[PDB]
Amino acid sequence: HHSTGENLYFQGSEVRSYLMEAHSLAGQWSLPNDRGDHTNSEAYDVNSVAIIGGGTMGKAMAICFGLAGIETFLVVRNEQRCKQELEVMYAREKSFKRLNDKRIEKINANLKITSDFHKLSNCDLIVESVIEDMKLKKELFANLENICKSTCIFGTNTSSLDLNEISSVLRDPSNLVGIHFFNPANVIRLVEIIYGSHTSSQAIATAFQACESIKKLPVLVGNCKSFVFNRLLHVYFDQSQKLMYEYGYLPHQIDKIITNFGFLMGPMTVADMNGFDVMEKLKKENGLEPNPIEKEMWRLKRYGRKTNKGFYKYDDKTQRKENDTEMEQIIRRVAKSNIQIINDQDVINFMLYPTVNEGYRCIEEGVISNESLIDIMFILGFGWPIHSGGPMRFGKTEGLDKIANMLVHWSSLEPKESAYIVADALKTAN
Ligand SMILES: [Zn+2]
C-alpha cells in the first residue's frame, strides 16, 4: 500500500503544507476506549533504528531515519546488491531534487548496511518491510524478541497480513505496531501509525515521537486507509480528466491552476510520474470503461515518464518535462457540458468540491472517522473546508455551505454522475 505515489495527488507545496499542518490535531492521539492516550503515555527515546528488508520501502524508510542523524541499520539479504540499489535510488532522487549530495553525506554517516542480526541488540525501534509471508514475519519478530532489549518497539509495514496474527506470536504482543510510510518518502510527510488490538500506549507514543524526530507527521488509525485514498484519488482525477475532454483544457493549464492553488504538483504531472499504465491495468482487471482521452493515450502507450511521453513529453538526457503538441491534438479533437466552467476558481471547484464530498461519503460509510480524515488532509497539505475550530478557508470559500450548494446545482445539470450527489454527512457537518 502507498508505494506507487497515490498520495502525490494531494500533497501540498511547502507553503500550503506549512499553513495546513497547523490545523491537524493528530498529535493529540488516543487509543480506543480506555487503552491510553498522548496525555498518559511514556515514549522511549529512539536513538537507534533498524529497518529489515532492502526493497523500495525498506530503503526509503532507512533514508528518512538516516537523514535525521539517527543510527540506522538496514538489514538485508544481499548487502552488495543493497548498496547498488541505494545508489540508483540516490541518483533518481537527486534528479527530482528530493535529495542532494550534502544530505546523502548525512544519510551515509548514519546508515549501516548489514545482514547480521546480532548488531541490533541496542536498537530502540525495528521496522520490518519484508515480503508478505505470514510465517516469515512471525518467525522474524519471534526471533527479534529474544535478541532485542525489552523496550524495543516492533513496527511492521505489512499491507496484506493481519497485524494481530503477527503479534499473536510474541510473548509480549503489545510492542507491535503498524507503520506505513508513503511513496515518495522524501516528499510525503504523512505516516500511518496503525494500532492492533493489543498495541500498547508506549508503543504508540514511541512511534509518534520517532516519526516527529524525523520530520514526519504521524496519524493514529485503526486500519490502513489506502481504500480511502484510492477513492478520493479516483474522484479527483476523473474530474481532472473531464476538464480535458469536455472542456478544452490542456494538461499544463490544469496543473498550473492546481499548483497556483498550492498543491505541489498537478494531476497530469503526477499521473506521468506514477505511470499512467497503472490506471489502464486497473480497468484491465474490471473492464472498463475508458474515457476518450484514456482510450487514445493507452493505445499510443503514452504512460508518462517510463515511456518518455504521457500527458507531457520527456526528452532523453536529464529527462526534462516539456509540453507535447500531439497531446493537444487528442484534446482539441474531443461543444458540450451543461455545467459552467468560465475561470480558474470554477476549475478548482470542479476538481476539489466533489473530492471533499467523497471524503464525507467515506466518513458516513464507516471507512474512516471524521477526525482521522480531516487530520490526514491537513497533514497532506490538501486542507479542509472545516476544522475543529469551525469553518476553514478552502480556496475562495470557507465551510461547507457554498460547496453543498454548488454540488446540488451540478447534480441538477448532470443527475447521472454520482460525484455530484451530496452526502448526508456533508449536509450534516454543514
Ligand atoms: Zn496504509
Side-chain angles (χ1 to χ4, degrees):
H1 293 325
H2 325 294
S3 78
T4 65
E6 302 91 317
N7 282 223
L8 265 179
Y9 291 100
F10 303 133
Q11 179 59 230
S13 63
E14 310 285 349
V15 172
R16 182 171 181 82
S17 304
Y18 187 58
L19 301 167
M20 288 311 95
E21 284 155 21
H23 300 301
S24 166
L25 293 179
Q28 288 164 45
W29 61 266
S30 171
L31 286 168
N33 296 122
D34 204 52
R35 292 161 68 181
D37 75 35
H38 75 284
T39 71
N40 56 40
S41 291
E42 175 197 6
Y44 308 112
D45 292 319
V46 164
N47 285 120
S48 195
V49 170
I51 302 290
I52 309 168
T56 300
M57 281 299 128
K59 285 196 288 286
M61 292 187 286
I63 285 178
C64 286
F65 282 98
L67 188 57
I70 295 157
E71 192 200 48
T72 307
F73 301 90
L74 180 54
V75 181
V76 302
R77 311 113 96 179
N78 189 346
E79 317 182 5
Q80 211 48 52
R81 180 180 311 247
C82 186
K83 297 186 199 214
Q84 290 165 181
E85 290 194 12
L86 193 70
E87 288 308 307
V88 165
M89 178 169 276
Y90 285 159
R92 176 172 161 77
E93 287 290 279
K94 290 203 295 158
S95 85
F96 288 119
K97 293 218 187 202
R98 300 170 181 170
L99 290 170
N100 61 40
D101 291 341
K102 184 76 173 164
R103 286 187 283 178
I104 290 173
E105 194 178 311
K106 200 186 199 315
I107 296 166
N108 291 337
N110 289 103
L111 176 58
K112 319 274 222 316
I113 299 178
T114 183
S115 55
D116 175 20
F117 289 74
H118 290 243
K119 305 257 175 177
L120 307 189
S121 69
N122 206 32
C123 278
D124 300 310
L125 173 62
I126 307 188
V127 198
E128 165 284 316
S129 194
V130 302
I131 52 157
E132 302 282 44
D133 181 324
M134 183 70 236
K135 288 184 177 159
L136 171 59
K137 300 189 196 292
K138 266 174 173 159
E139 204 197 285
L140 168 75
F141 287 120
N143 197 307
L144 286 165
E145 183 146 52
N146 20 258
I147 197 60
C148 297
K149 60 195 197 198
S150 59
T151 50
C152 192
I153 299 319
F154 299 148
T156 169
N157 91 149
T158 190
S159 281
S160 64
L161 304 174
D162 170 281
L163 200 160
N164 305 312
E165 316 299 21
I166 308 180
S167 62
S168 82
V169 313
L170 298 145
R171 304 157 210 149
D172 192 353
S174 78
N175 48 319
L176 181 79
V177 66
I179 304 181
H180 284 188
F181 283 53
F182 286 78
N183 205 58
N186 300 312
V187 185
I188 315 292
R189 296 178 70 193
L190 184 67
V191 178
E192 289 168 344
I193 307 305
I194 313 166
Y195 61 83
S197 49
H198 199 59
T199 303
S200 74
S201 68
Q202 281 115 324
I204 298 306
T206 306
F208 257 76
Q209 185 171 282
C211 290
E212 292 160 347
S213 75
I214 69 175
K215 313 271 92 185
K216 296 286 191 194
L217 296 161
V219 63
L220 191 59
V221 292
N223 57 310
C224 174
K225 307 289 178 190
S226 58
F227 292 89
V228 182
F229 302 119
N230 289 325
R231 287 182 57 175
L232 293 180
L233 187 168
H234 288 288
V235 164
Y236 173 66
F237 194 78
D238 282 29
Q239 296 307 107
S240 292
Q241 295 210 247
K242 281 174 190 169
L243 288 170
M244 285 182 306
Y245 63 78
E246 277 169 31
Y247 307 83
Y249 290 86
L250 318 189
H252 70 283
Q253 306 190 303
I254 293 150
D255 289 1
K256 186 66 183 177
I257 290 164
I258 289 292
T259 63
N260 285 351
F261 180 82
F263 292 103
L264 190 72
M265 293 170 204
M268 322 320 165
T269 300
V270 173
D272 280 6
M273 300 257 287
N274 293 346
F276 198 34
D277 50 344
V278 178
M279 314 266 307
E280 186 193 31
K281 191 242 262 184
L282 181 91
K283 289 177 181 185
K284 195 140 78 271
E285 252 86 74
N286 48 306
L288 287 301
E289 286 277 358
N291 72 241
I293 313 284
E294 289 178 334
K295 235 169 212 281
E296 189 71 52
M297 265 186 300
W298 296 329
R299 167 196 274 87
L300 317 186
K301 308 223 295 185
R302 293 167 66 88
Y303 295 147
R305 284 192 171 263
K306 72 197 292 176
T307 49
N308 279 94
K309 46 183 181 176
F311 285 103
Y312 293 82
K313 52 165 258 199
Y314 306 93
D315 134 70
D316 267 57
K317 212 146 199 199
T318 64
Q319 299 292 333
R320 63 170 225 91
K321 197 198 296 156
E322 203 180 286
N323 286 197
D324 187 274
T325 196
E326 192 185 55
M327 192 58 221
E328 191 196 316
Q329 278 168 287
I330 308 169
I331 310 294
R332 286 290 156 261
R333 204 168 59 258
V334 204
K336 230 79 150 61
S337 196
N338 301 329
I339 294 149
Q340 292 278 92
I341 307 292
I342 57 157
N343 59 270
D344 283 16
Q345 194 47 51
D346 296 338
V347 171
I348 285 307
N349 296 348
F350 192 79
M351 274 167 302
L352 271 26
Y353 288 17
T355 304
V356 172
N357 182 246
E358 179 65 14
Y360 279 102
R361 213 64 111 170
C362 294
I363 295 161
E364 73 181 7
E365 291 172 36
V367 191
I368 190 158
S369 87
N370 171 276
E371 294 66 40
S372 282
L373 182 63
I374 298 179
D375 284 342
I376 284 161
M377 303 310 287
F378 281 117
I379 284 163
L380 286 166
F382 184 101
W384 208 245
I386 267 191
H387 71 135
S388 64
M392 173 62 209
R393 196 193 330 280
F394 186 83
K396 291 262 170 272
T397 205
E398 84 172 33
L400 293 176
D401 196 45
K402 314 280 157 275
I403 292 172
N405 289 318
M406 198 86 318
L407 288 162
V408 300
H409 170 223
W410 290 336
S411 197
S412 286
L413 307 162
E414 190 102 358
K416 293 218 169 214
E417 181 69 68
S418 54
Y420 310 124
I421 314 267
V422 183
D424 291 334
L426 199 165
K427 285 142 88 106
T428 285
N430 186 20

PDB file of all heavy atoms in Angstrom, residues 50-67:
ATOM      1  N   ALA A  50      16.335   0.050  13.268  1.00  0.00           N
ATOM      2  CA  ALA A  50      16.647  -0.961  12.294  1.00  0.00           C
ATOM      3  C   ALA A  50      15.467  -1.137  11.368  1.00  0.00           C
ATOM      4  O   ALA A  50      14.324  -1.103  11.792  1.00  0.00           O
ATOM      5  CB  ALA A  50      17.055  -2.325  12.950  1.00  0.00           C
ATOM      6  N   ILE A  51      15.771  -1.262  10.093  1.00  0.00           N
ATOM      7  CA  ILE A  51      14.781  -1.466   9.063  1.00  0.00           C
ATOM      8  C   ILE A  51      15.157  -2.809   8.427  1.00  0.00           C
ATOM      9  O   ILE A  51      16.281  -2.971   7.912  1.00  0.00           O
ATOM     10  CB  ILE A  51      14.836  -0.365   7.982  1.00  0.00           C
ATOM     11  CG1 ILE A  51      14.624   1.064   8.571  1.00  0.00           C
ATOM     12  CG2 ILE A  51      13.872  -0.709   6.838  1.00  0.00           C
ATOM     13  CD1 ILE A  51      13.195   1.373   9.066  1.00  0.00           C
ATOM     14  N   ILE A  52      14.238  -3.771   8.477  1.00  0.00           N
ATOM     15  CA  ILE A  52      14.547  -5.092   7.955  1.00  0.00           C
ATOM     16  C   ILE A  52      13.945  -5.239   6.579  1.00  0.00           C
ATOM     17  O   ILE A  52      12.721  -5.076   6.398  1.00  0.00           O
ATOM     18  CB  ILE A  52      14.077  -6.206   8.919  1.00  0.00           C
ATOM     19  CG1 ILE A  52      14.598  -5.928  10.330  1.00  0.00           C
ATOM     20  CG2 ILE A  52      14.574  -7.587   8.458  1.00  0.00           C
ATOM     21  CD1 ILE A  52      13.944  -6.810  11.399  1.00  0.00           C
ATOM     22  N   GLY A  53      14.808  -5.503   5.598  1.00  0.00           N
ATOM     23  CA  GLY A  53      14.373  -5.639   4.206  1.00  0.00           C
ATOM     24  C   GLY A  53      14.875  -4.500   3.333  1.00  0.00           C
ATOM     25  O   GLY A  53      14.670  -3.319   3.666  1.00  0.00           O
ATOM     26  N   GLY A  54      15.509  -4.844   2.203  1.00  0.00           N
ATOM     27  CA  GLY A  54      16.093  -3.845   1.295  1.00  0.00           C
ATOM     28  C   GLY A  54      15.332  -3.535   0.007  1.00  0.00           C
ATOM     29  O   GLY A  54      15.919  -3.077  -0.993  1.00  0.00           O
ATOM     30  N   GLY A  55      14.031  -3.800   0.011  1.00  0.00           N
ATOM     31  CA  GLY A  55      13.128  -3.295  -1.029  1.00  0.00           C
ATOM     32  C   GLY A  55      12.968  -1.772  -1.014  1.00  0.00           C
ATOM     33  O   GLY A  55      13.606  -1.059  -0.241  1.00  0.00           O
ATOM     34  N   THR A  56      12.100  -1.282  -1.876  1.00  0.00           N
ATOM     35  CA  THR A  56      11.899   0.152  -2.087  1.00  0.00           C
ATOM     36  C   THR A  56      11.512   0.901  -0.808  1.00  0.00           C
ATOM     37  O   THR A  56      12.100   1.928  -0.511  1.00  0.00           O
ATOM     38  CB  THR A  56      10.795   0.369  -3.174  1.00  0.00           C
ATOM     39  OG1 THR A  56      11.223  -0.242  -4.401  1.00  0.00           O
ATOM     40  CG2 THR A  56      10.526   1.845  -3.422  1.00  0.00           C
ATOM     41  N   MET A  57      10.508   0.431  -0.103  1.00  0.00           N
ATOM     42  CA  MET A  57      10.103   0.979   1.187  1.00  0.00           C
ATOM     43  C   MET A  57      11.092   0.822   2.283  1.00  0.00           C
ATOM     44  O   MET A  57      11.245   1.669   3.069  1.00  0.00           O
ATOM     45  CB  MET A  57       8.754   0.453   1.644  1.00  0.00           C
ATOM     46  CG  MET A  57       7.596   1.114   0.993  1.00  0.00           C
ATOM     47  SD  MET A  57       7.472   2.854   1.291  1.00  0.00           S
ATOM     48  CE  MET A  57       7.345   3.350  -0.317  1.00  0.00           C
ATOM     49  N   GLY A  58      11.724  -0.316   2.345  1.00  0.00           N
ATOM     50  CA  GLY A  58      12.807  -0.518   3.297  1.00  0.00           C
ATOM     51  C   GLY A  58      13.889   0.546   3.124  1.00  0.00           C
ATOM     52  O   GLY A  58      14.303   1.203   4.100  1.00  0.00           O
ATOM     53  N   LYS A  59      14.353   0.712   1.879  1.00  0.00           N
ATOM     54  CA  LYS A  59      15.384   1.703   1.570  1.00  0.00           C
ATOM     55  C   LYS A  59      14.838   3.119   1.878  1.00  0.00           C
ATOM     56  O   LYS A  59      15.510   3.926   2.495  1.00  0.00           O
ATOM     57  CB  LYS A  59      15.816   1.591   0.103  1.00  0.00           C
ATOM     58  CG  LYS A  59      16.722   0.388  -0.211  1.00  0.00           C
ATOM     59  CD  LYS A  59      17.427   0.529  -1.563  1.00  0.00           C
ATOM     60  CE  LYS A  59      16.426   0.350  -2.745  1.00  0.00           C
ATOM     61  NZ  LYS A  59      15.989  -1.075  -2.969  1.00  0.00           N
ATOM     62  N   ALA A  60      13.599   3.401   1.484  1.00  0.00           N
ATOM     63  CA  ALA A  60      13.050   4.740   1.695  1.00  0.00           C
ATOM     64  C   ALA A  60      12.933   5.076   3.191  1.00  0.00           C
ATOM     65  O   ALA A  60      13.293   6.170   3.602  1.00  0.00           O
ATOM     66  CB  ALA A  60      11.730   4.922   0.951  1.00  0.00           C
ATOM     67  N   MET A  61      12.483   4.128   4.009  1.00  0.00           N
ATOM     68  CA  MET A  61      12.425   4.364   5.443  1.00  0.00           C
ATOM     69  C   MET A  61      13.799   4.554   6.052  1.00  0.00           C
ATOM     70  O   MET A  61      13.986   5.433   6.880  1.00  0.00           O
ATOM     71  CB  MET A  61      11.664   3.263   6.197  1.00  0.00           C
ATOM     72  CG  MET A  61      10.164   3.214   5.912  1.00  0.00           C
ATOM     73  SD  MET A  61       9.331   2.015   6.986  1.00  0.00           S
ATOM     74  CE  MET A  61       9.860   0.449   6.259  1.00  0.00           C
ATOM     75  N   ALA A  62      14.759   3.735   5.661  1.00  0.00           N
ATOM     76  CA  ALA A  62      16.106   3.868   6.219  1.00  0.00           C
ATOM     77  C   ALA A  62      16.766   5.201   5.895  1.00  0.00           C
ATOM     78  O   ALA A  62      17.517   5.734   6.700  1.00  0.00           O
ATOM     79  CB  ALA A  62      17.016   2.681   5.786  1.00  0.00           C
ATOM     80  N   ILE A  63      16.503   5.708   4.696  1.00  0.00           N
ATOM     81  CA  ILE A  63      16.959   7.022   4.263  1.00  0.00           C
ATOM     82  C   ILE A  63      16.395   8.116   5.187  1.00  0.00           C
ATOM     83  O   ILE A  63      17.139   8.975   5.674  1.00  0.00           O
ATOM     84  CB  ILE A  63      16.572   7.272   2.787  1.00  0.00           C
ATOM     85  CG1 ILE A  63      17.483   6.472   1.846  1.00  0.00           C
ATOM     86  CG2 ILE A  63      16.606   8.773   2.446  1.00  0.00           C
ATOM     87  CD1 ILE A  63      17.109   6.652   0.369  1.00  0.00           C
ATOM     88  N   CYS A  64      15.090   8.055   5.437  1.00  0.00           N
ATOM     89  CA  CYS A  64      14.410   9.019   6.273  1.00  0.00           C
ATOM     90  C   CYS A  64      15.025   9.073   7.680  1.00  0.00           C
ATOM     91  O   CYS A  64      15.285  10.150   8.197  1.00  0.00           O
ATOM     92  CB  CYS A  64      12.925   8.671   6.373  1.00  0.00           C
ATOM     93  SG  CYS A  64      12.005   9.056   4.877  1.00  0.00           S
ATOM     94  N   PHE A  65      15.227   7.916   8.303  1.00  0.00           N
ATOM     95  CA  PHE A  65      15.844   7.902   9.631  1.00  0.00           C
ATOM     96  C   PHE A  65      17.316   8.381   9.599  1.00  0.00           C
ATOM     97  O   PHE A  65      17.759   9.100  10.482  1.00  0.00           O
ATOM     98  CB  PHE A  65      15.731   6.514  10.285  1.00  0.00           C
ATOM     99  CG  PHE A  65      14.380   6.227  10.851  1.00  0.00           C
ATOM    100  CD1 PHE A  65      13.452   5.474  10.126  1.00  0.00           C
ATOM    101  CD2 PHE A  65      14.017   6.721  12.110  1.00  0.00           C
ATOM    102  CE1 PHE A  65      12.176   5.193  10.654  1.00  0.00           C
ATOM    103  CE2 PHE A  65      12.762   6.472  12.637  1.00  0.00           C
ATOM    104  CZ  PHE A  65      11.835   5.682  11.911  1.00  0.00           C
ATOM    105  N   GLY A  66      18.053   7.962   8.578  1.00  0.00           N
ATOM    106  CA  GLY A  66      19.440   8.346   8.443  1.00  0.00           C
ATOM    107  C   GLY A  66      19.611   9.842   8.227  1.00  0.00           C
ATOM    108  O   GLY A  66      20.535  10.441   8.768  1.00  0.00           O
ATOM    109  N   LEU A  67      18.706  10.441   7.453  1.00  0.00           N
ATOM    110  CA  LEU A  67      18.742  11.871   7.136  1.00  0.00           C
ATOM    111  C   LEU A  67      18.591  12.704   8.408  1.00  0.00           C
ATOM    112  O   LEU A  67      19.099  13.814   8.494  1.00  0.00           O
ATOM    113  CB  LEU A  67      17.632  12.206   6.131  1.00  0.00           C
ATOM    114  CG  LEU A  67      17.556  13.608   5.480  1.00  0.00           C
ATOM    115  CD1 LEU A  67      18.850  13.993   4.731  1.00  0.00           C
ATOM    116  CD2 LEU A  67      16.364  13.706   4.507  1.00  0.00           C
TER     117      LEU A  67
END
